[PDB]
Design a protein around this ligand. Structure first.
Ligand code: PLP
Ligand code: PLP
Ligand code: PLP
Ligand code: PLP
Ligand code: MG
Ligand code: MG
Ligand code: MG
Ligand code: MG
Lengths: 392, 391, 391, 391
């Protein structure tokens, strides 16, 4: 009986708000020390919420960091220019040459590319696992495995991990490993990752936290064991976010509850319609019974967001792809998601297989990924129905 | 002239659309009307076509065009701050087994990135005296990949002989990546890429923003190194928000009038300090006798407002408090490049600890000043009152 | 299809230019490429062509198009806040010797504009009971130029019978300008222009912005009244900054989902208060039995989250402090329409003083609540704890 | 010490909270922790205690303090733009039956406010020649309540003899409200309140913002007039958004270095125009021979960069296009006070139409220039090429 109240109030303390409802926006590089003693005090608390230097943050950042720590149950929150920077720099913060990373083969493609194109040449190897491996992940853990990287639901194809089984297996074989999750789909709040034994919860706050498709920012909330190393190594890479975007992220939290409930209701309705449609082969929605890992979503999540995908009954030709995608009236073609607008994107099976390392896909039709926004669901259904008629 | 270029750089109709300044386009998602439009945007995702917010919007493109014009580069990568620009530009060009050769006067966070991040990834770092000049050739190893310059040096303000260093590097390792932290010159008082440096890095936070209220890093690369810088910085998710990019473009418009005042005022202060009976030496690139001044005179078109001086005595903590706590106009803070004057102190052992494989040549307390836009006679009176407190 | 319209209103390519939201164009000067371009912009300076910052930029045009679509008007004037919109919209249609007829439940600053500004300029003001309905015809004078409505009324929440009032006004004074402060409905829960009202005024500060961090007023006029409103507001220099206009457009996108929560939660709180032994009366338009509820049910498509209730006793200043000072979730502040729940107390004599020529019909302290987006159980517990402190 | 005052004005710890610049506090609702705190805020709602966003936040308070310090006033009211500041400051001091006496060189929208808004409200307007000096006494009527000055005049740049005007007004109507549009001087090059003027009004849009990307009006009043200005502007809902207030404070920090460049460059251009064979007259307050130059020299501490000149001939329509359409650096746009140079043309009869009860004394085409921060030799070359197109 608290999440909605926590979202409205998280990070909103008088020291940050100074009498307004929202935190003040403190734009600053230089932060002034009135005395040498004040400078000494600030230096000793430069990572503990005392004004020291803009790269460590201002009151606006401290307010957002407190909100993220409260909502995701962590000991600290690092901020980044975008989600991709959060993933790359959080992984980097915990590896050194000779280490091994174990990542789900459904990870967001830029996350994979960071591992294969940056980490590889820096002496860090990456292995892969099927998202439904569950307890069998233990057999893949090597003596030098330092990081296990989860993403539930997976990117595009939406497979849900059995996180309890994975975490228990990792803690049995490699108790000191750093378990991370890209928790963007859950907005960090529909899946309480740190309560499951995960060490760090990473978000592209760009998506649901910002909620309006007009700001970019990454967050990483770490437990007490991992916070200091994440904080100091992210700082050595100069990672931070501007004060105004931090303000807009805090601001987005306030409507996250009401927004996510609509995204859940509308997207599940669309998925249930698609699941009965003669032109659809498969619907990948975590909240839909029968979807991959749905039993884990039902057990471990408190709700759903609005992003999912479905497979058409056929592989669209280039001409059919253009006829389908070019003539939507409400859905817009774009990258990213999590805003008020509904989006659509297409992928051929071989496009997905190319970003499923050491694995193949199990479908042959064209995959359509939908983000269901805040439009009237009957209008969205009519848009999709017209699209079906263009490719029949 | 530079003042005209600063006023107009990056201001094209496609960005400004009737206003004086570029529009502010806040976006993650960028919409493709057709599959063909998406294909075109993908092909030009790094060439100023709208593709995805992490690659930029019209606002970023305008700033990038301004920076390329002003610094004479093929591309400009953007970062959340100067420290991110340095760390990720170096990282973009190294791999396990490589070697980085860096001036021992590099900004401390730049050194810390090398010794704490690169070292654990199998990338080693070596050091050189800022005045080493042509003799840097003897320090280039078979695996040296990056040569990192910073002229003037951090805090102590030594000016490199860049033509001598570059010629020496190109004689031994013509393919090496030469980088410079060009923040003190705001990228315009020293045309790094015209000297054969490959990448000019800036904490745009300082003079480009110019008001101490935004943080952003830039890296302008020549044609040979741009694609690797662009794509590897992108793989690390590096970008800046649209509003800060707008404020950086906006800062350019007054950069000329601001720098001229910083130069005039700071040189007056340095000249007075150079004759002062409590001052051992003044480190100001524009002051005759300062280390590398002849190279500043030859290679720079002007000066900014940041410099340092060494006191005759080592202040005690009690004297440091009496001195610094009671200034009326100078403020204690990190960073610089704004309209306000700032002051910071370092003891010699503090500087020695960030001069790897080298010794300091002074024993008194080192004071770093940023000279802002206040009336210079008011600033001189503030400094004179300070001297009276540490007699 | 209100949710769809809210998501798309004002979003045309010329404004969004590839992003989901409009670009932010900050500008005073707007540049003309040729003499012919200057002529064209001058003729269309009030018709959505870039002429001068005071007339607006692309960002303002986007919001104005959205507001005209959502409220079904011919034009939308923008103002620095709701009070500026009310004051200047009334002023735009009066001259010396005119008469204004205003509901006695009007927002107090709206009353004060009439009694302190209009009065000294030769414009008189008369008052009517919010439930007068068709009997307003007897109050219309030959010089009555404006009839000003506010439904539900400020604080006490009485709902007008707008159809009866409009029909009566048109019978007697067909040319009179009928205005309404439609802030409680966010302009969308009550379609004022469809009822024959001429101008719908909003403190967009409230639900359109929706986060308590921006101030802006809007006034949407029908075709008959738009040109006069537009030009007379412009002569008073009324405008809003581009960034606030952007944030207002942005607020529209979540307005439907927000209002539905405000409706559900506030009605649940009202139903609990209506059975509470320490409550004398609940003033919620959506609650059966409230003053004008039958008119809300018939004429509105929903409810927002602002309402009030009367305590069984008039709290003393000591009891008022014990009550208000110790709420954990409700905050004491002016304004409303945000994500946070707010509480504000008015003693009955305070209300009577801002009910011109009328008395109040209650004797307990009046508590006005804005129900935000918090968990209702927590809000009820906060209210329950308050009751325990004054029982 | 103006540069030092500009850097530090309004920058107190209560507003800056550790940063160099004031915090940006966006707010409508301002929370009261207790009933006692609310009573204190209510009592001091116009005295810098947080009460309600329409009265201001910390950001507004900081700007107001800076403006009061820089212009030597008791209070500073904020408006959405300069036109709103003029219209509402006049309206704040008149009532039906009053008379306004305004210079016939007043900014045209200021005149249109008087003839189109004030007139229908029973307030009349008279006019005087800007060089009338002591002879203004003969135009003061028993009901003259406001005397409105603008020095230099709009477009034609005539400088008032303010001491002679004020002395005459105080002899005849000591209680009259003397106002001045002090935008050209940016409120700092002419200390209006020190001359006995009651209210100094500014389009802060111009030089205070300094970058053509924000609109805001200010009015600084002496102690005698502050309360009436403050409360009556508030009844009209006049305010500015927090972010623009921040950007205005920020513009102050470079105002000194900018104005000195605008002065130096614009006077160089004026001196060149004054000796040019294609120029009939140059209207620049700092140029000897210009109308009222002796008053500028005596009463101002410097110049900005806006002025005008008259061509030797009346350009035809074709010549106007050839002249204005082909400039490379000067842009055609309204407003001024930014970093870019601007050019606009007016035929004599256009000016005569906005010179009430007066004619113009020139027959050539009038060119108004704003001289920005570009290199002045580049600007001179642009103007020279323009002369060659019409010779
Ligand atoms: C979008 C996405 C990212 C990248 O976020 P950006 O802010 O766009 O860099 C990371 N993880 C997931 C799951 C994403 O969908
Ligand atoms: C300040 C500084 C940096 C770091 O810039 P930030 O924007 O504060 O991260 C980099 N290089 C130099 C020379 C600096 O002085
Ligand atoms: C708040 C309020 C206003 C004034 O709005 P502001 O934006 O604060 O000026 C006007 N009308 C009503 C009904 C209000 O509640
Ligand atoms: C531009 C101008 C104004 C009006 O200022 P805005 O902010 O554009 O409304 C007022 N006075 C003078 C002298 C001006 O030039
Ligand atoms: Mg594969
Ligand atoms: Mg050493
Ligand atoms: Mg009464
Ligand atoms: Mg005339």
């Amino acid at each position: 009986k608290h999440l909605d109240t926590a979202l409205v109030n998280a990070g909103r303390r008088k020291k940050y708000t100074q009498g307004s409802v929202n935190s003040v926006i403190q734009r600053a590089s230089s932060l002034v020390f009135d005395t040498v003693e004040a400078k000494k005090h600030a230096t000793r608390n430069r990572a503990k919420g005392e004004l020291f230097y803009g790269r460590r943050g201002t009151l606006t950042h401290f307010s957002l960091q407190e909100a993220m720590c409260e909502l995701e149950g962590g000991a600290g929150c690092a901020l980044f220019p975008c989600g991709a920077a959060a993933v790359a720099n959080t992984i980097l913060a915990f590896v050194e040459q000779g280490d091994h990373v174990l990542m789900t083969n459904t990870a967001y493609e830029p996350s994979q590319d960071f591992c294969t194109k940056i980490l590889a040449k820096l002496g860090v190897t990456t292995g892969w696992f099927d998202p439904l491996i569950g307890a069998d992940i233990a057999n893949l853990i090597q003596p030098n495995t330092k990081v296990v990287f989860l993403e539930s639901p997976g990117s595009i194809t939406m497979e849900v991990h059995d996180v309890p089984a994975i975490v228990a297996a990792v803690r049995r074989v490699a108790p000191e490993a750093i378990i991370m999750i890209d928790n963007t789909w859950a907005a960090g709040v529909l899946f309480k990752a740190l309560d499951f034994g995960i060490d760090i919860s990473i978000q592209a706050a760009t998506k649901y936290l910002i909620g309006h498709s007009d700001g970019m920012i990454g967050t990483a909330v770490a437990n007490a064991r991992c916070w200091e190393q994440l904080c100091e190594n992210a700082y050595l890479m100069g990672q931070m976010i501007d004060a105004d975007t931090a303000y807009m992220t805090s601001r987005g939290l306030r409507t996250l509850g009401v927004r996510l409930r609509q995204h859940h209701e509308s997207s599940l309705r669309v998925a249930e319609w698609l699941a009965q449609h003669p032109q659809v082969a498969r619907v990948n929605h975590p909240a839909l019974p029968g979807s991959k890992g749905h039993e884990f979503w039902k057990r471990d999540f408190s709700g759903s967001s609005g992003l999912f995908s479905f497979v058409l009954n056929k592989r669209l030709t280039d001409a059919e792809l253009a006829a389908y995608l070019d003539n939507f009236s409400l859905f817009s073609m774009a990258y990213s998601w999590g805003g008020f607008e509904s989006l659509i994107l297409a992928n051929q099976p071989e496009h997905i297989a190319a970003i499923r390392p050491e694995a193949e896909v199990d479908f042959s039709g064209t995959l359509i990924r939908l983000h269901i926004g805040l439009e009237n669901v009957d209008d969205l259904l009519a848009d999709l129905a017209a699209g079906f008629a263009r490719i029949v």
